[PDB]
């Protein structure tokens, strides 16, 4: 109803702006221990914006100058997208163990994880078991048979990462277990990650 | 099933000099057959970690038990010589042994020693910041947990170089 | 050697760095003769009155346990890194140009190779476009440039270029009727650091 | 952490340059781009003057922090900057390299300039060794960024932390666990 949104709506979101709209939420997963929220708007955003700019080229599909530039920017975009998904592929390809368990805690919406990832992941875990098929499956585990209880991959949430200040330059004391006394706006007092899976889901703070 | 690693099972193996308080039976992997389901209260024994990982630090089937490197004397003067206690390869990994073994002491000292030792790496690799030349530099005073970050920091500089211009 | 051989087992890949002649299915046969060599003993005392429930077995449970731990998870690495290397070179190309040999498939890796290729295929279908554009990601980085010419190379083997050509002889001087979709696979798995 | 990953960050920044065309075989992109007229400045990113100057299309000029006196006073302030100093664009270590490759065809004083950037780079880095030389008792709730730049910090990143977890696990376990009279792991 209330128009004029940063999404694909009744206003111009620049290719530069569509860079902005998820650049940080890619950089976070670069520097991180566990999975972060999923996003899905991109899949229609990119393909829409990119196709429109493509056809805008496609009229003048011979040039040397600006057709070329548009192509270059497009390639930069695809680098970023492939990189995001490379990392998340990697983390769940590792973390097929108890990632499923938070998901059966709620099975979140597009927030936490995405469905095709789930198909991917359960397909894989079936593969591992039906590969172990041709190892020891006259005597496959007599108790710990399927997806197991001590077999874990990515539980750890204290990989001490760098945090970027962006808020009240005084100690705006906010959600974290530790003594985040002496918070600020352009500073950092580094800490673990478990204690803040909060501000970055608030996007109060950022990573570096 | 571990704090996993390619070193997944350099984990439950370190052999000891474990003594005895009471009787034993049927030593199994020792010279044992149908020969001893009985032995003495008091006998030093070399023993793995795996079966004893879960054998009752309170209970005494076995006893107060340390290795001699792991005996407290050198380790004490190396919390006073937490400055140049030198390692080599007679005890190549020396860094997270207590990361199992600490509660089996009955004297409550191990972890303090160890943490001090690696606070020294909080001070140590001040000098380690570059790859100056050819193959290898100093590659035998090393646990193979410091080996990893050592190679890693080397690489970090190695590619920083290629950044340094078009190079 | 008492649970160490994987240092030897991935030593199959010792020369196979990027000067790779080929590969094989090493290090399974005698070693997984173990898994059935041992369950006999591990379950020899099974629900037995041989001891009527006392302390004595308590290592032996663990003997089994650690034996298995080493076994299974060694094996996890033994396929896992293989997925990893094949995935890397398969980021250098699709399944257009398959593995060097397709004879170092330790049988259940039927499941695994195909599973990985097609899990990724599914994810591809999601990716690129909502319908799914398997979208060129890691090869043929010509900006808008020629479509139909052949070029010079650096002596490939594998001979897997089926694409659109009668015979392009995918090696050095693979120089024939080469279109664009002919030449759509290999960039750095060992050819054209030099045209 | 790389030589180019940060140019996906750094190289997107802008200056304003002069071309020798007006609006091209295409006029202009639907975008923040300005109208193209030769003989006059135009604002662009710096992933293109690269593409353009070597395409023999344009001239170019720098920012203003690319000078002498700013880069003669920032250093002496930075001397007793017990923490950090003036930060002209905060990733000038990547802009300056991608600047000083080609543009020194016509940039002025591209050598004493380089001298100073190295002179400031090394010192700030070296400072970023000695910060470590006070870190006691697991102070992973206290640190410095206040006028940091990024091209220095990624030169450390993988080293310490993938260790620092199990390093200060002995004391990070302390405000996260319990035992009897002695310290816990």
From Swiss-Prot, chain D:
GO CC annotations on file: CMG complex; GINS complex; nucleus
Disulfide bonds: none
Keyword Nucleus: yes
Keywords attached to this entry: DNA replication, Nucleus
Residue runs in coiled coils: none
Location in or out of the cell: Nucleus
InterPro entries for this protein: GINS_A, GINS_bundle-like_dom_sf, GINS_Psf2, PSF2_N
GO terms, biological process: chromosome condensation; DNA replication initiation; DNA strand elongation involved in DNA replication; double-strand break repair via break-induced replication; regulation of DNA-templated transcription elongation
Alphabetized CDD domains for the sequence: GINS_A_psf2, GINS_B_Psf2
Signal peptide residue numbers: none
UniProt family annotation: Belongs to the GINS2/PSF2 family.
Assembly and interaction partners: Component of the GINS complex which is a heterotetramer of Sld5, Psf1, Psf2 and Psf3.
Protein task: The GINS complex plays an essential role in the initiation of DNA replication.
Name of the protein in question: Probable DNA replication complex GINS protein PSF2
Native organism: Drosophila melanogaster (Fruit fly)
Taxonomic placement: Eukaryota, Metazoa, Ecdysozoa, Arthropoda, Hexapoda
Gene: Psf2
